[PDB]
Structure formats: structure tokens, C-alpha cells
Amino acid sequence: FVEMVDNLRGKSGQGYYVEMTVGSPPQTLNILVDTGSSNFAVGAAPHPFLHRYYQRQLSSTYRDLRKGVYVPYTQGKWEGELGTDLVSIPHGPNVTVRANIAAITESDKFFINGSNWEGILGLAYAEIARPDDSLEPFFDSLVKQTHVPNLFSLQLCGAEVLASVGGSMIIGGIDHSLYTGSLWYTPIRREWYYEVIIVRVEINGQDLKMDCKEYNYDKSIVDSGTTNLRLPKKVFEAAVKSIKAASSTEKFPDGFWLGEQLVCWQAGTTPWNIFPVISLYLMGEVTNQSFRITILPQQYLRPVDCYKFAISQSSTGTVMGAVIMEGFYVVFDRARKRIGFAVSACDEFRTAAVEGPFVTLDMEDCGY
Ligand SMILES: CN1C(=O)[C@@](c2ccc(OC(F)F)cc2)(c2ccc(F)c(C#CCCCF)c2)N=C1N
Q1: How far is the CA of 129 from the centre of ligand 1 (A)?
Q2: Given ligand 1 and candidates 18, 32, 33, which is best to mutate, with the most ligand atoms within 8 Å of its CB?
Q3: Residue-by-residue DSSP string for 326-350
Q4: Where in the chain is the domain with CATH 2.40.70.10?
Q5: Cβ(329)–Cβ(345) under 8 Å?
């Protein structure tokens, strides 16, 4: 998997993308790695934010499925045309797949100005594919057509323009050099999103003491296509109160805590130690057993030395977005219906951690 290391790039808050080629001859595009959706959806017509796009006309191997797709969603919308073509990942496995491609012809608030990607690689399951679950997701095609093992892993690394970020998507395996210590696994509750179960939450060692159903209300998911840790309303309010209290030696405006206003210190003086660590305890493979992943302010204050608060409110459940994933090497073990976490290879007092087991009772009752 040596050749797949550092195959991801992005700008802070604009997602991580992998280089792909579509069609014959190959057309090079940058594609968002998105565990929170299930379509391979690519810009296929001019757009003000797109500097290149997929040209079906130019591909000898393109096949029209003669059906459209319209996807309205919360933040925006897109419209397109379904078909198939040959798809490769130059810094991925040495294979070529015939995949479904939604060629986006019209969109609103979908593409991001300056992001440097032109499409999305939906890595989640067929249940949430558009227009419906009959449209085989890319990874499913890849596994069915090739000898690639049914697993992928993501090392998303942190670190005037938006700061450039990097990482690795290891397709078909686990690269031991990308993590230290043990890999701890949480069950995939249901194969639609990468749905998981959080059984408790601590801020600086202090239990939020909520009924665990609250942490998963109405679901909890692992989503590389979301920047923030997003939390259900009641959990969000409990969390910010706790973080405000720990960092009380300094005062910040409401705009900061609402994740919309930046906060600055002079270069090098960021008081990391006034901000608490946050531990999410995930359901273990064994009943009554959990493990915790612990994240630092360095993860949840996102650089814009100016930072935005990267924890925000959700009405669609918990979203463990890039800022959770950036602490860790994350294994999407589809074959064994489980997601692994270990401390990623990528300050002086604190470190991100993955630690277990911890005995917490009635974990199945945390669902919903
Ligand atoms: C939450 N989320 C989205 O809204 C979405 C998405 C993807 C496909 C969809 O339709 C499907 F049918 F093609 C609908 C929604 C998404 C859409 C547009 C975007 F610029 C981004 C992004 C980004 C970079 C910041 C976090 F990286 C994510 N991906 C996620 N995880």
C-alpha cells in the first residue's frame, strides 16, 4: 500500500480529495472522498466553481443508461444524467472498474468555490444511493469486478489562502505505518450510512451523564464529507456549556461558540491548555464493552493564528466529521461490518488517544 500513502489533498474546511481518471482516454479529476454518501457524482458541464469537468462526448467507453437523477438535499441540490464508464485511481490499486457515474449538468450550492475538486466519491452503501439502491456504488463495483478486499482506510491529517491538508486512502487494506498502538473496532449498526453507536461522552474526564439514546438521536455516523463534529441539540448545548466552563479564564463571543466567527491569537500563543479534551466512547464488538477516542482542541478548533469552533448543532444526529477523523487512522472494514480506530501517525502535554476496554452497560439500548 506504499503507493497509496499521501494520495489525498485538500484545503481546510473544503474536504479531502483523491485524483481519479474517468473514460478513455483518461480524464483526470479531483474527487471528494465522502463516506457520508453513496453516489459517484461528477461535474459534467461548465460551472463557475469548476475549472475542469467530465466530458462524456470525449470518452470512447462511456455508456448512457438513459435515465436522469435529481437530488434535492438540505444544503443544496444537483441534477444529472446516469451512465457508466471506466474509472481508475492513479495512486490507488492497479485496477480499472466500470462504474456508475452521475454526470452533473445543473447544481445549486453543491460545488465549493476554490476547493479544487470536481466530483464526489460516495463510499457509503447502496441504501442511500440516488435515485435508489439499485444504482451500485463505486466501492461495490470495485470489489465485485476486481480482487480488491472489501475494506478501505482513511488517514486524514490536519495542518493568505486556506491551509493545505493531506492524508491517505488505503484501498483494500490497512497500512500499519499509518498508526500506533491498537486498532479498536465499533460495529457498523446498519449498512446505509456508516452508522455507529456512541455510549457515553466526557469533556475533560467529566461525564455528560445523558441517556445514551441522546448521543445517537436519531443516528450517529462517520462522515469524511462533513468538516465538524456535529451533535444533536441537547448534546451540543451540554458540550458547549462544559467547554465554556473549562476555558472560562478567557472570554469569547457567542459567534465563536456558534461556529460562525473566528477567534485569533498572535502567532504561537494559542492557549491550548485552557481547552478541554473530548472523549467519545463507542460501542465495542462485545456487549457491555466500549472504547474511547479522545480528541484535543487541536482537532476541534479549525485553523482559518485564527480558529473557528468546529463543533456544531445537528438535527439529523451525531456526525463524526473530519475533525474527529483527523485524530485517527480509521478503518472501514465493510467485510466484517465494523469501523476501526487507532491513533494516527500524523502537543507537549496531550495526545489524541484510542483506549479500551471500558465496561458500560446496556449498549444496544443506546440505538436511537
Ligand atoms: C453531509 N454531506 C453532504 O451534504 C454531501 C453530499 C454528497 C452527495 C449528495 O448527493 C448524492 F446523491 F450524490 C448529497 C450530499 C456533500 C455535498 C456537497 C459538498 F460540497 C460536500 C462537501 C464538502 C467539503 C467539506 C467537508 F468535507 C458534501 N456529502 C456529505 N457527507
Answers
A1: 12
A2: 32
A3: TTEEEEEETTTTEEEEEEE----S-
A4: 16-148, 149-368
A5: yes
Concatenating the DSSP letter of every residue in 173-189 gives S--GGGEEEEEEEEE-S
- Of ligand 1's atoms, which has the minimum distance to the CA of residue 130? 12
* Positions marked catalytic: 34, 223
C-alpha cell at 179: 498508526
Distance between CA atoms of 352 and 157, rounded to whole angstroms? 13
Distance CA 229, CA 313 (A): 9
- Cell, residue 20: 481519479
Specify the CATH class of 149-368 in words: mainly beta
Ligand 1 atom nearest 75 alpha carbon: 4
User: Distance between CA 161 and CA 146 in Å, rounded?
Assistant: 40
- Alpha-carbon distance 355 to 294, whole Å? 8
- Domain 16-148 homologous superfamily, CATH: Acid Proteases (2.40.70.10)
